[PDB]
Amino acid sequence: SEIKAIAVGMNSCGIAAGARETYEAVKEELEKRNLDIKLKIVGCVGMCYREPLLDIITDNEIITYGHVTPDRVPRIIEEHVINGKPIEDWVVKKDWWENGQRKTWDFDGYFVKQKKIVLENSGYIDPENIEEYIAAGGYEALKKAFKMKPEEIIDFITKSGLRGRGGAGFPTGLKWKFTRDAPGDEKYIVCNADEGDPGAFMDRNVLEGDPHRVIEGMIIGAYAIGATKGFIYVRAEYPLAIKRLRIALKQAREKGFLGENILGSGFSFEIVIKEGAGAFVCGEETALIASIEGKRGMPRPRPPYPAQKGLWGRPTNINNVETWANVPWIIKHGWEAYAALGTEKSKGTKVFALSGKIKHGGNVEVPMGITLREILYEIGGGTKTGKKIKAVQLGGPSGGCIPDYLFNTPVDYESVTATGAIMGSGGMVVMDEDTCMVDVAKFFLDFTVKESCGKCTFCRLGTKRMWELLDKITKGEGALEDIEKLEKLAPLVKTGSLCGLGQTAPNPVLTTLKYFKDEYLAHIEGRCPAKVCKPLIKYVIITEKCTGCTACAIMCPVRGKPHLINQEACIKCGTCYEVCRFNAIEITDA
Amino acid sequence: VKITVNGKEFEAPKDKSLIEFLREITHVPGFCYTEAFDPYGSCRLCLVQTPRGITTSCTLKPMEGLSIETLSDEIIEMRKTALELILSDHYGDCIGPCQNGCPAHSDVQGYLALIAMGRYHEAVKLMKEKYILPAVLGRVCPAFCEEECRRNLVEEPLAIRQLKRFAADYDLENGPWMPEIPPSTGKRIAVVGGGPAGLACAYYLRTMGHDVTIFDAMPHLGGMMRYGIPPYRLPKDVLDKDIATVINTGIEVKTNTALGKDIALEELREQYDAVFLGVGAWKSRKMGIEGEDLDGVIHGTEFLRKVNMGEKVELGKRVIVVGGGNTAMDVARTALRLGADVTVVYRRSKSEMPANSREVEEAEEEGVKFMFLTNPVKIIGKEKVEEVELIKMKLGEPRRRPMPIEGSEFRVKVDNVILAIGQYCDEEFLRTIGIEAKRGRVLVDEVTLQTNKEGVFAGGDLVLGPSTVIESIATGRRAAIMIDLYLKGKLEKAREVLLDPSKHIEEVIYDEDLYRVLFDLRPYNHWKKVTEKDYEHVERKPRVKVKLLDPEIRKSNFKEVEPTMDEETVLTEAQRCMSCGCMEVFRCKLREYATLYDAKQDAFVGEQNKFEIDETHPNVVLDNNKCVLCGQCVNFTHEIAREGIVDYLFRGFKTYIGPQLGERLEDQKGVFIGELTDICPVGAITEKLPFVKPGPWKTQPVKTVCNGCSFACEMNIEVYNDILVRASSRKDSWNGYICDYCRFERPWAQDIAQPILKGNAVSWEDAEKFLEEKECALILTPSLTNEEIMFLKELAERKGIPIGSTIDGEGSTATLEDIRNAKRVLLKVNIEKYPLLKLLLKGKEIVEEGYEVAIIEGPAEPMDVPTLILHDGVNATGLIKAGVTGIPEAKAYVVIGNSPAISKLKGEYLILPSGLWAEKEGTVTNAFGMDLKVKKARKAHYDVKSL
Amino acid sequence: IQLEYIYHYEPNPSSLIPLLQKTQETFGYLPKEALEEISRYLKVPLSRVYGVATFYAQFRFEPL
């Protein structure tokens, strides 16, 4: 029908790409060409590689345009809302309805194997309006769950196989059952939004694009468990998420979903936004409890579990944002639909952050028990420049690198766990032939060393020792004895640590040794096959292909002729090989 | 519930952590556990093997059917790796380099501290634990301890040998110190050789229990101390006194009874339990050149024994001596005194001379000519020696064994040639006794020092060849250790453990002998890689010089060159010590675990954090360089003390335990800062001892109570042979902690020296005259034990004197359990005055009405509710049985102890001293009405009851 | 005075991290006197205030 709304994705990823400028340009253009068309903001659809995204919404179809800078907004306005012609070149996504469902056509084939459960409403509803979430079928699961007994809700969640999307894959229904059965009267539930992975932003994306989904999941879980107060532990480094959570909480409170006598059921529940100062370790549940209580986030021995003794002693249920976001879908479509997806031991769908050297990167909602190479080559589109992918690391900086020949491995909890990696945050960093695996292991060990709380001896000391060994190998000052020390120390650091940070700390080194020991042995000989380690390579200019750039040594801090490079005092930085004319600077060894 | 540990069925409590029960039954290392706080997983050393994997036992509560493997190969590997990781960050020295450099490895720092304090007998007692004959060693030892002393990095090494000589002379003259001999073990040991090695083996087997018999060929003891070392270096009366010190322990001496001439080694083994061959190397090695048989060629050892024994040796004017050892020096300086012109010839350079360096310098002062890098070729003469041809030598790169130059013809006309090339024991004698040897040096295992004949050990110059007195004494002590081990059948397991103890840790724990041998012979010593830059802050102090006899008068008499230093400079020299050893070396658990698990400091090497030491506090030191980050101090100060003295600062590898940013420990207003010294397990928080030199001593704790207030907290006083060192906290004490007033103001270590008569320090005769002349009343301060109170009361009863006390009242109906269980308290006493109430009343309701229990100040009347009345006297509850009442208002008083209430008395008062609290034995009653034992740290100098 | 913000927060130790964040907003850092007033108002030791402040990398103590 007639164009009813113009929408722009205004999550953190969209803002970073420039969705604020697009929003202002659209508002200015609607003012200048006088049109009474609604201008709302939506979340991130999932296509993070084409931001900003502008949506043209009719009663029957949605036509999404990618890479919408302010300069092309006048053209799309004039061509689509004034004349009525789609610009098929810029149409990156088309969305229509067939018999009550949502059908998507993608230019790049991104959505063919995707099953959006957590992220179904992201990019289609206004996160700042509860009326749009209500009209899109939201909060109906809340009313259905209020018509159910809490024990029935717990069994409902148990039957779905909804394992912990927080990384460890614990059965969420068992967690709720433990928290409800915990002896006490006053209970709390915590949303774990302290997403410490610098490469994963799925939970923040759920909290921004569809916050009412998280709020509804928390209210369903609180009614099932018997909680009275709810805490959303989100970093103060996420300001947009906090703002949208606050406005969504106040809108739910004014519509009888939060506060006293929620929907006349004798149930009172308020949600308090607790802000963490920012640490990778305080995302762990025990350190999260310690930081909410006002202490320093040092994880404690877990067998006194947070479900039994959480915030101020009283029982606490702590779930990931994605785990809370799966709950409304389960109560709405039943557990039969969630058990219809995935492998036997890993049901449902998983949200993966595709990053690294991948082509169609972003947040993918994919069923569990999917072949890795499908995600890597069809959904991800392979590598950006067509180069063969050497390996993929799963679980963020605490995960492991799975090599290219194990891409037939199904993506599930048991398969990825047994391969050598872990689910972790849910990030896939694509590493190709150009990537040195020893440097990658050093990068992840440096992140682990930085983010350790410094409590237990194994993490605090052995992680530093492993990083020292990796820096010794990377500078070429290593030997087979150092490799032997690493192969001894890494299993010991994995076994002897107290929290999951140190237990997952040796994973990159272990997987690189298990799969890419060729570069391990080659770095002993003073040679880096990937030609990226600074002390093991240099940069030389070949006269046979050079020209008169006159800025080859000027752009780089370090006339019409092949210039000179001081290899003796070079930094091995690399601001010549990227800013180069023709192909005039080979790398070679030193 | 019941669990299985290492395959043996056990019963364990279900609520307590497993680490307690496991530490009861086996050895489970761990720093960060205590019952007072929740389990902490910051050290990861208490690992056990479970069905689910490897996990820490402190966080494990016992579960039915659980299988625990405490000493699997993986568990040992993990614990060793964890200890190596911890040691990679540890900074400090367990012992000083003076102890490492000493071949006997003696506690140099401790007896230097004892010398600084003025207790020379105690210094000699500490010397005796590692070597015999401290006077002989103070006169002759090459001073290996001063070669690597940390004062070499400042100005000059400490005069350890000279101070040891002074202390040994003081002990010899002012009553010798004799050790205690344990009861007879029923085994007799035979020693063949009366030298330093034989004497050391005999002394250390006598101090273990086994009777020792010494076999020596010569009529006197000492061997080459008597017939070797000349009397101008070692007077023989000093040697007689020192050997008397050794032999008075009960060693039967058999002289003129030689092995091979009187008894055989087979019969020696048949008639004795064990045998040590300290026969020395009495045979001199012939040089091996043509013409050695000429008249006028004599051996150096034969010349020295002829001179020492009092015989005539025909010596000409021109003497050439071949050798570079101590033998060549002694023959040179002895032939110089006989009226010769003596030259010494040596193959190698000056720095490679095995001789004592100070003796070389003294010989240069006395006029001994030295030829270095030369060696004889042949001895020329018809029948007597007239000239000897030498060749100049030059040792090239390979050891740098000397190789002569092609030709120089060093021909010198000399009258006598004296050979001191080296020493060995006769190969014919070694072969005929069936003892294997090579080049005359007996072949033994390096660790056990045991020969090819079972039961036969060896050491000294027989094994090591050209050794010293201290090295021979060290080999003899090691042989005594191994003879004791072989006597109880533990030699093979001990050899394997000393080779590697990380494979036999259970056997090390099970047997106390193996534990002792491991910690005596192979202890883990953490070392600091220090240079000159690390001691730029210490004050330079000159090394004291002892005046030698004048060289010109020295070269013509056999009188002692070097005298004993003056008593005035002894303290000054002993106070230059920098105390490099760790103050908690005898209590640090990191050291114990690294000894048991064979941890290497060099296994993981890298960055370690450098922290400055926090000595700003009056009585507590905080050294973060030795912190293992167990958090027990933080947990104490933030959970029990609730003072917040220190806390974790920063995170990761940069974490430390400090007060706060911008402040140090002196600015903190806590009263439980001294408890952190007992809390810390690895010597990061230590206590400043009041002595001039606190050099660590192997102290023994004694169980007593404090007298600061009426709580009378149980504590351990650390004593080192009548020295009152410090107060520590016991685990089996109901309070568990002691306050900083008791630790640092030390009410237990002070009293009044003289009786007080109107501010006059009168003698006891005047006090007795005052007491007898007047019929004064008897007033008792509460600083006396129950037996003293009963004695004074019985004396007053049978002598008819009114009896009273400085405090009157009744009550204290509240037990400790009542204070623990009650929820509401009434607080009238000042909390700051009584610091234990801070710990006892933490987290309890302080209300004005409806109180279950109350705390009130004496004098007071007991209430219906359980009431606590706090006086200021330790035994102020001594009125609960005696009913001693108050001041009876008489004319003049005798009061035993000093109290502020003495000023309230009317008339002249005689304050009798109440005695030193630490020197009293008895029972006291505290506020809670529990009878606590008091024990004496030292012997009581004067008694209150006999006053 | 600038320390009026402490009295809008509940005088409980759990308010420490929100109070530290508000102090970092108000001054750009954590002043000595502000931290002391936080210690007195929350009745928590100053050592624990500094431990929490030093645990997180964003908290700064210099006036910057």
Ligand SMILES: Cc1cc2nc3c(=O)[nH]c(=O)nc-3n(C[C@H](O)[C@H](O)[C@H](O)COP(=O)(O)OP(=O)(O)OC[C@H]3O[C@@H](n4cnc5c(N)ncnc54)[C@H](O)[C@@H]3O)c2cc1C
């Ligand atoms: C500063 C210094 C100077 C020294 N100067 C000299 C020196 O001038 N000359 C020198 O020789 N050493 C010298 N020494 C070394 C001296 O011998 C040391 O005492 C030696 O290291 C210890 O010897 P020992 O215990 O092995 O036995 P020794 O003291 O060498 O004597 C061995 C004993 O075994 C006895 N014995 C020998 N054969 C038999 C037998 N068959 N049966 C029974 N008993 C037997 C001997 O009578 C003697 O009592 C010096 C050492 C130092 C530190």
Ligand SMILES: NC(=O)c1ccc[n+]([C@@H]2O[C@H](COP(=O)([O-])OP(=O)(O)OC[C@H]3O[C@@H](n4cnc5c(N)ncnc54)[C@H](O)[C@@H]3O)[C@@H](O)[C@H]2O)c1
């Ligand atoms: N009786 C009970 O109530 C009970 C028993 C067991 C477990 N649980 C609950 O189960 C859950 C899982 O426990 P666990 O011990 O298996 O695991 P855990 O809570 O120690 O989490 C470990 C996992 O964290 C993941 N991870 C690492 N870095 C991450 C990051 N940056 N972002 C997200 N995830 C990251 C890794 O995949 C790793 O496997 C917890 O919530 C726990 O309380 C409860």
Ligand SMILES: Cc1cc2nc3c(=O)[nH]c(=O)nc-3n(C[C@H](O)[C@H](O)[C@H](O)COP(=O)(O)O)c2cc1C
């Ligand atoms: C170092 C570390 C960081 C973690 N970060 C997060 C996180 O950011 N979000 C999260 O949900 N769980 C995180 N976890 C896992 C939590 O400890 C815990 O398992 C999680 O809250 C359970 O959520 P779930 O029920 O959805 O699995 C982390 C764990 C570790 C060891």
Ligand code: SF4
């Ligand atoms: S493994 Fe690292 S982060 Fe975890 S408790 Fe130990 S030191 Fe802290």
Ligand code: SF4
């Ligand atoms: S950038 Fe390349 S072409 Fe340009 S001057 Fe440098 S080497 Fe020559």
Ligand code: SF4
């Ligand atoms: S970019 Fe770096 S490596 Fe290349 S020429 Fe410049 S300084 Fe040298």
Ligand code: SF4
């Ligand atoms: S005694 Fe303990 S704290 Fe001191 S240096 Fe040795 S290992 Fe370190």
Ligand code: SF4
């Ligand atoms: S015996 Fe010698 S090396 Fe040992 S402490 Fe005494 S003087 Fe020093």
Ligand code: SF4
């Ligand atoms: S200064 Fe004292 S403790 Fe240190 S090495 Fe010298 S003698 Fe030993």
Ligand code: SF4
């Ligand atoms: S200073 Fe504190 S944290 Fe460090 S070792 Fe001692 S008790 Fe443990």
Ligand code: SF4
């Ligand atoms: S509380 Fe009183 S009795 Fe206990 S140690 Fe301190 S002064 Fe002594």
Ligand code: FES
């Ligand atoms: S980890 Fe168990 S005692 Fe430290």
Ligand SMILES: [Zn+2]
């Ligand atoms: Zn996005």
Ligand SMILES: [Zn+2]
């Ligand atoms: Zn490389």
